[PDB]
Design an enzyme around this catalytic site. Structure first.
Site, PDB file in Angstrom:
ATOM      1  N   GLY A   1       0.830  -1.192   0.000  1.00  0.00           N
ATOM      2  CA  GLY A   1       0.000   0.000   0.000  1.00  0.00           C
ATOM      3  C   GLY A   1       0.865   1.244   0.000  1.00  0.00           C
TER       4      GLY A   1
ATOM      5  CE1 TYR B   1      -0.669  10.707   4.773  1.00  0.00           C
ATOM      6  CE2 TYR B   1      -0.392  10.541   7.151  1.00  0.00           C
ATOM      7  CZ  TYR B   1      -1.188  10.422   6.032  1.00  0.00           C
ATOM      8  OH  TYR B   1      -2.504  10.060   6.187  1.00  0.00           O
TER       9      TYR B   1
ATOM     10  CG  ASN C   1       5.898   7.733   7.021  1.00  0.00           C
ATOM     11  OD1 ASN C   1       5.065   6.843   7.220  1.00  0.00           O
ATOM     12  ND2 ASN C   1       5.728   8.680   6.108  1.00  0.00           N
TER      13      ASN C   1
ATOM     14  CG  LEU D   1      11.359 -11.619  14.015  1.00  0.00           C
ATOM     15  CD1 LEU D   1      10.906 -11.831  12.584  1.00  0.00           C
ATOM     16  CD2 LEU D   1      10.849 -10.265  14.548  1.00  0.00           C
TER      17      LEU D   1
ATOM     18  CD  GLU E   1      13.179 -14.772  22.716  1.00  0.00           C
ATOM     19  OE1 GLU E   1      13.066 -13.817  23.517  1.00  0.00           O
ATOM     20  OE2 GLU E   1      13.766 -15.844  22.997  1.00  0.00           O
TER      21      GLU E   1
END
EC number: 3.6.5.-
Lengths: 412, 426, 426, 412
Positions: D9, D197, D201, D225, D227
């Site tokens: 996106g 924006y 970000n 991860l 974890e």
């Protein structure tokens, strides 16, 4: 250990900038050093802006400077209820954000000007919201109550009979410094018919330095904040002692400076030197906290005071044998480089509860009635979220403050 | 034997600095240094006040209790201030409010456990413990309240070891505080029922004795303190020295307290002559008893001449004849048979060390247990009532979790204490 | 004799760096260097922890087990990190998830065989094996799960050699993890049934003991670790030195474990004085027992004063009198008869090496088997239930191939373990 | 060991360019160094083109930049079914071509914007096709779910009730960062009414750096991860924790930077600092993964957290004794050379599952109904290969997500 401070109302902020000045001045922390430990509230931007534009500009965090661009309004109601409300949360947030960061604090030295809009009203609920969020601390509010004849605002009493009743059931010890009775000191004990507000501020800015600053500072007879309220209030009414300073001599005119203790202490009880038009017209002292600073021998005190205890014409309350809290600090005072304060090597900032205010309150209450008796500027509050209640019911309030300050004395 | 000093409050603390300022020199212990002792005898008995760790660092075994940082931070930031092991500093950064109740029930009660902790670390030091020295003023929070607690706990932990108490009873003429009789009456109460030897000093009995018996014109506190500390050195430490006839806390206690109250004494030093001139040396001995036994020269406020004695302890410390000592004491006991109580054939307890106060030739500490001190607790007790009656600054006590029956208690107790003491004056 | 250290998990690993940081210096072994040993005695027994290959390269014989690269890659990229033969690094680049189940059944179970492989290469090194040292934390994956497996396998391979376990039981006040009691209860379970000597350390029992017994204001982890590693050196390595009366893992084991559970101890070091000042040297000996046997100073969380002892092992290491040692121990056993259990006439196991900790004059490791540690497994066990009841972060376990009966098992087991321990406190 | 990432996106791509920026920035790999490890998907060319025209232009392979010149369409249906379909294959191909090249990976950090066309729909089937092709891995999707009152698209909810139901049965752990609730942080904790924006970000671009970047990076308490999902999800619902950062102080205004752990950790639980308008209005935490980075002493943590565990007003779930995964990294954070981020030497990116979202989902579900209740922009999806089914049947879906997030808490 610490004691936050909330300077509310333009005045409480002017006095604030002052007391805040004297500070760094005697701690060797120039314009840009550490970090304060207080906040600034006002519903008129232009004034807090003065702390944002003028001196001591970067010594603060734009976070401990609260403003409500909106309107001040020299009326309690609006400042307490209607407008003042909107800001309070935010205000609190800092005294909860600044109250956390520290390490086991002791309380909040509040600075307000009794007869104002942002000073009377607002605080009313600020101290209000404190007594509940930290009932477990000290709430010593340092006020500048209404000049006995030289008031400013037309309504003043409305605003001061209202800040008293709402704060009464919330403060620990309320210090009082009379704006007019300080002028006398500037006329009679310093000589100057040119006293800018910036001076009275330097003065309280002094007497105050003797309270927190130096006291929270090591010494030969330390006195904690709690100490005060304990040794200073005989009864729950957020009792209001009076501030007094001793070496208020002029740094130009006369020069006898070297005025050993024996002198500076006697200079506290003469009514013409007490930052309050409450001349001991009869008011029996009931507790005094003689805070000394500089070169002072404990015997000198535990003698200079003895001599006093036996002057009788200084009549202390009955139910009180001894009411003399001797607070001794080391570091002598610290006068502005070139203002108008003498600069001695010892001073006496004695504060006390005196059955005297029986007057000051009286004379200020009466005021109120006269106007209320005709509703005068009442429509200004009603239309601001108040009622015939809050007035009439805050009048009755002080009424029992005229009886209180009467009963706790004059009788044996 | 041993002891462990206790600096309760600021005063008791301020004095600590002077009691240790002295004592050390009377034991050749420099700031952190060791034993520079001009002699070799000022060491065989030091233990009584120190501890062996390094080999040049004999650290004073005392306790520094106070709820006001600045104080201990003035004593620890000055001269001998850097000899106490930090462990000794039991501070209470809280608000050291001037309330007996604030340092005995609410604020001090917390800091207590963290004190007793150490008072045990020091007691369980080594050898055999004798007792604890306690300095403080009965006219404040950290002094009368918190220090008066420290003992009530000590006396539950070792009802065997003794408890000398050095109290700065509220001077008459002028009170260096306002509630004074409140903080006082409340602490004397605790005293009459825990410590078993109290030496009451009066800031103004000192001035006098320091401005007329020492032409000293500017008697700073340091001085007063210094004079006092001079007496407490003659008492303890001293007797922990050799002597033809030496005694020790107990002897002093077991010869001075006829009746369990604990009774309070009034210390008096011997050679108390102004510097230059006066240095008359009239110190053969009749000159010391001349001194010690006069009215003025009694660190107490009251005057002996105003009430019999029960016991007396001339703790001399300087080479003299057990004859010219034992003798003098007698005439003294006969010239004043009037005031010296009779049901005690020999009130006086002659004690005799050998080595004298470092720079002096002959001295003699006086510890009198006279009935005269009745006329002081009276004073105190009066001030109370006159103000209690109106509950003056009582809200600062109650509001701190106190009782209206607590004040009643103390006064009475200490008030009765006055009564009793008269039971012998007659 | 010999032993083979085991650095399970990060913690157990981080500590490895400190245990070896120390030990080496206590054996003159520079990074990759050899024996610079100030003496000649720090070599005749090294074998216990190293291996001979080059002639200047005595490599630590330990294992580094962990499923998180970064860790071992911090220990291997820093100081002494370049002394371990790479073969020692049994990493698991997988996701070292903080799940006991992820390092014991799913992720660790794979890396195991590639570990046992080495644990055998090291065991079959030479001479005679004694046991293995195990470091880890019972509050994570690679620690409690995978390390608790490493042993369950070790104890099947040599049910003869001993198994000392150094566990960092979950500190009370604040838990440095969230499931903590999950990873813990599950590992203690495995412990009570494989290793036969466990020394439980508490990150906060250390802080305390490190911030008040060492005025140390900024106790970094390195420190804590360092202090711990100080004790595990006194234990093992030490006794592998001469002594009037020396012992060794077994003696320690065969004198400290009355009942097969395995029982956990609580180590305590002797001279624990702050740097400069404190350097009191009051280390004659009564000073060491004074130390060791006090509440604070027990690396454990619980306080001995809260429960009898079954056994005690003062493993001293510094020239002293088998009399002033054997003696002291006694009074200690009588002043505290209260808590020291009775059905053991002489609970204490006096041990005495000769050479002390490199730079010190006299030290003494304490290994206590007190019933007090009941009040810790209680803690842990509580935390479990309070959260198990709601199966809190249980999906991270089950979802990893676990069982709802597995957690039940452990708690109970370890929970019963609490029970038993009380059977002696009474 | 690794973790691919699929930024889907426009938004997920803008945020992507950002998170991707912060990366090299703290790894010393300028414009043209190594090779990324992710891909970029969008059905509107002009946006991915921004990664093809603007900065970090040559740091990517025109192969990991997927585009469908066609049409985006702010509607789920079209993006998921109809159009989005055509691209998926190709998309997958890269996450199968990039997933092969590596060495024992751990998962794919997905970046999408819940309420979009290419972000909601597409991914829906991307994550969809992943859960089947690599069920044996981690699927942590980092979402930017619908601003509570400041949404953009008119349909937003349609697109977000649909990306939730389709991804729910496919993700491992879904991180959430609320676009609006981040603005507050830019207004209240950094001061700037000019937040591009490009800033929000930089922020997520920060909180994210704390997740993967540094964590997959060695440290004193590594956290894989896996974890996460393990220590972070109590139940199969692809549970959505919230991202929070601590030292979000301004690199200009105030400066107390040196804010020891004890402070930065407390600054995580105050609701005004959590990149999500899900103020802990009641939501009991049920697991938090305190990822620290920089100079931090494990005791400092295993204490700062202890203090918290006993604040009670922070009420953690019942069935959860201890739910605090302490993740410690070494290398301190790394702030943009001159953006507006303070730049401290330690931070706390704490994320967690809070019964709080019971709200956020609620308030977003309700939205949906209102419109569906009238079919509003329904004809836009139907005509795009969807049916009354997918809507009504994805509504019922979340319904049991309002009950789920309710049952797993509020009850004992």
């Amino acid at each position: 250990r610490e004691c936050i401070s909330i300077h509310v109302g333009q005045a409480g902020v002017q006095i604030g900038n002052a007391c805040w000045e004297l500070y760094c001045l005697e701690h060797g922390i120039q314009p840009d050093g550490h970090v304060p430990r207080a906040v600034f509230v006002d519903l008129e931007p232009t004034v807090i802006d003065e702390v944002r534009t003028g001196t001591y500009r970067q010594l603060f965090h734009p976070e401990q400077l609260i403003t409500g661009k909106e309107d001040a309004a020299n009326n309690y109601a609006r400042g307490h209820y209607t407008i003042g409300k909107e800001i309070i949360d935010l205000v609190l947030d800092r005294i909860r954000k600044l109250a956390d960061q520290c390490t086991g604090l002791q309380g909040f030295s509040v600075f307000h000007s009794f007869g104002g809009g942002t000073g009377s009203g607002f605080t009313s609920l600020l101290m209000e919201r404190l007594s509940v969020d930290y009932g477990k601390k000290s709430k010593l509010e340092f006020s500048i109550y209404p000049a006995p004849q030289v008031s400013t605002a037309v309504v003043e009493p409305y605003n001061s009979i209202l800040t008293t009743h709402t704060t009464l059931e919330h403060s620990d010890c309320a210090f009082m410094v009379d704006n007019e009775a300080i002028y006398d000191i500037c006329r009679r004990n310093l000589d100057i018919e040119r006293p800018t507000y910036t001076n009275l501020n330097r003065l309280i800015g002094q007497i105050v330095s003797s309270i927190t600053a130096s006291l929270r500072f090591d010494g030969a007879l330390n006195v904690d904040l709690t100490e005060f309220q304990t040794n200073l209030v005989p009864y729950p009414r957020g009792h209001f002692p009076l501030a007094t300073y001793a070496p208020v001599i002029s740094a130009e005119k006369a020069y006898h400076e070297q005025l050993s203790v024996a002198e500076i202490t006697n200079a506290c009880f003469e009514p013409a030197n007490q930052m309050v038009k409450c001349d001991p017209r009869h008011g029996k002292y009931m507790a005094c906290c003689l805070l000394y600073r500089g070169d002072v021998v404990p015997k000198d005190v535990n003698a200079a005071i003895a001599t006093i205890k036996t002057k009788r014409t200084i009549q202390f309350v009955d139910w009180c044998p001894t009411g003399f809290k001797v607070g001794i600090n080391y570091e002598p005072p610290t006068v502005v480089p070139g203002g108008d304060l003498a600069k001695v090597q010892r001073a006496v900032c004695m504060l006390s509860n005196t059955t005297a205010i029986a007057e000051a309150w009286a004379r200020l209450d009466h005021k109120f009635d006269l106007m209320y008796a005709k509703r005068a500027f009442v429509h200004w509050y009603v239309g601001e979220g108040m009622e015939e209640g809050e007035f009439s019911e805050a009048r009755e309030d002080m009424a029992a403050l005229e009886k209180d300050y009467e009963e706790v004395g004059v009788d044996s | 034997r041993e002891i462990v000093h206790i600096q309760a409050g600021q005063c008791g603390n301020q004095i600590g600095a002077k009691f240790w300022e002295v004592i050390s020199d009377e034991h050749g212990i420099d700031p952190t240094g060791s034993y520079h002792g001009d002699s070799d005898l000022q060491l065989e008995r030091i233990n009584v006040y120190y501890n062996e760790a390094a080999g040049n660092k004999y650290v004073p075994r005392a306790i520094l209790v106070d709820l006001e940082p600045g104080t201990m931070d003035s004593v620890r930031s000055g001269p001998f201030g850097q000899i106490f092991r930090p462990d000794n500093f039991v501070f209470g950064q809280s608000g050291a409010g001037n309330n007996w109740a604030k340092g005995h029930y609410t604020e001090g009660a917390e800091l207590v456990d963290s004190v007793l902790d150490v008072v045990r670390k020091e007691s369980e030091s080594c050898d055999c413990l004798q007792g604890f020295q306690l300095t403080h003023s009965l006219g404040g929070g950290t002094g009368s309240g918190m220090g008066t607690l420290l003992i009530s706990k000590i006396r539950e932990e070792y009802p065997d070891r003794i408890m000398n108490t050095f109290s700065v009873v509220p001077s008459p003429k002028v009170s260096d505080t306002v509630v004074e009789p409140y903080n006082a009456t409340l602490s004397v109460h605790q005293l009459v029922e825990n410590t078993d030897e109290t030496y009451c000093i009066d800031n103004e009995a000192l001035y006098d004795i320091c401005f007329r018996t020492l032409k000293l014109t500017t008697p700073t506190y340091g001085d007063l303190n210094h004079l006092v500390s001079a007496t407490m050195s003659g008492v303890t430490t001293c007797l922990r020295f050799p002597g033809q006839l030496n005694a020790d806390l107990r002897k002093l206690a077991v010869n001075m307290v006829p009746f369990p109250r604990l009774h309070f004494f009034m210390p008096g030093f011997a050679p108390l002559t102004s510097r230059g001139s006066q240095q008359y040396r009239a110190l053969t001995v009749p000159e010391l008893t001349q001194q010690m036994f006069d009215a003025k020269n009694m660190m107490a406020a009251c005057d002996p001449r105003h009430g019999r004695y029960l016991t007396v302890a001339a703790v001399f410390r300087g080479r003299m004849s057990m004859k010219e000592v034992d003798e003098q004491m007698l005439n003294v006991q006969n010239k004043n048979s009037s005031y010296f109580v009779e049901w005690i054939p020999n009130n006086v307890k002659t004690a005799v060390c050998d080595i004298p106060p470092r720079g002096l030739k002959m001295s003699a500490t006086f510890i009198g247990n006279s009935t005269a001190i009745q006329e002081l607790f009276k004073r105190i007790s009066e001030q109370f009532t006159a103000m209690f009656r109106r509950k003056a600054f009582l809200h600062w006590y109650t509001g701190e979790g106190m009782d209206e029956m607590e004040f009643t208690e103390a006064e009475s107790n200490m008030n009765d204490l006055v009564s009793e003491y008269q039971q012998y004056q007659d």
